[PDB]
């Protein structure tokens, strides 16, 4: 299947803008899951600050990337074989927990073994690209 996890994270200038419209940085976390159901059950608060060890136990490993406004950070991760779902979540100033534009789940099939998949951050949303 896929041996090495490759991700490329783009970012425009207007990301995580405050009430003054100020371009702010953001912290994005990468999760290697055995279960995706608990990753779809947690809210914004119990995922980044909570002690849901049912979700944390399904997290095999976690790695935090840290991108400037208007830049990019490449992800070269030795992908675990039990990592059925690559959990991508971000911490905006205004995370829309309702419309759920702050997290995406990338399964085993949608990875590429020698090409990074492109995740673009804009405004306060997460966006994939073909």
């Amino acid at each position: 299947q896929i041996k090495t996890l490759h991700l490329d994270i783009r970012a425009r200038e207007a990301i995580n803008t405050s009430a003054a419209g100020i371009p702010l940085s953001v912290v994005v976390r990468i999760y290697q899951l055995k279960d995706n159901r608990s990753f779809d059950s947690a809210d914004y608060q119990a995922l980044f600050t909570g002690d849901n060890e049912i979700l944390a136990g399904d997290i095999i490993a976690q790695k935090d990337v840290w991108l400037q406004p208007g830049g990019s950070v490449a992800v070269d991760m030795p992908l675990d074989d039990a990592a059925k779902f690559t959990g991508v979540a971000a911490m905006f100033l205004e995370p829309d927990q309702k419309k759920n534009t702050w997290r995406v789940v990338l399964g085993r099939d949608e990875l590429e073994p020698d090409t990074p998949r492109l995740i673009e951050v804009s405004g306060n949303t997460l966006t994939l690209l073909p």
């Binding site: 405050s18 100020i22 371009p23 702010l24 912290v27 914004y44 911490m91 100033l93 995370p95």
Partner: protein, 205 residues
Amino acid sequence: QNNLSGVLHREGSRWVPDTINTRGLTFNPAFLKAINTLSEIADVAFTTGNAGLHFELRPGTAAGVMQTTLITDNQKLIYVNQMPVWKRFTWPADTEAPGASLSWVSTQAGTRQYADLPGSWGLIRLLEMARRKAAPGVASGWSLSWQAQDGRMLNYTLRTEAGEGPLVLLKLRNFVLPETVFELSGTSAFTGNDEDAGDTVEETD
């Protein structure tokens, strides 16, 4: 309470003079202000004898800077532009290496700490330097500027509990217990505005 107990009746939190039922004896107004300030310290910070207050603390909102970190009394506040959520800090802690510091991460550099101040009286030392404070938000409504080097500023918005919190401890600077009471000099003087004017200069600058 016993040396001039017919003169100054304890009343509320201040000290009221008009209880001598006597004429022909004033006293120095330099004494009566300097005891009112001390009793206002006595009813904000020291409520149980053991000399400790506690005050809610601050989230961060920044402009071109991230990883604003402060440590005091092993009560960390690390902050990387998450959702802003309050904290609660007891000011005299248990045994530790007691002190306080501020450290930020610039866009083009690593961590460089602003200033670390050791000792149990450190939190009131490093908080002196940004008294641009008055804020029209929450009830006790205070903010802090902390203009560090190279133009990067890091804001905070302080919300206290009982009166003025730990900002009232800045009133002790340049404060000496005065000379004589019951002095003949100073017969006619009206200086009942400095207790408003010092906070006027404080809460605007």
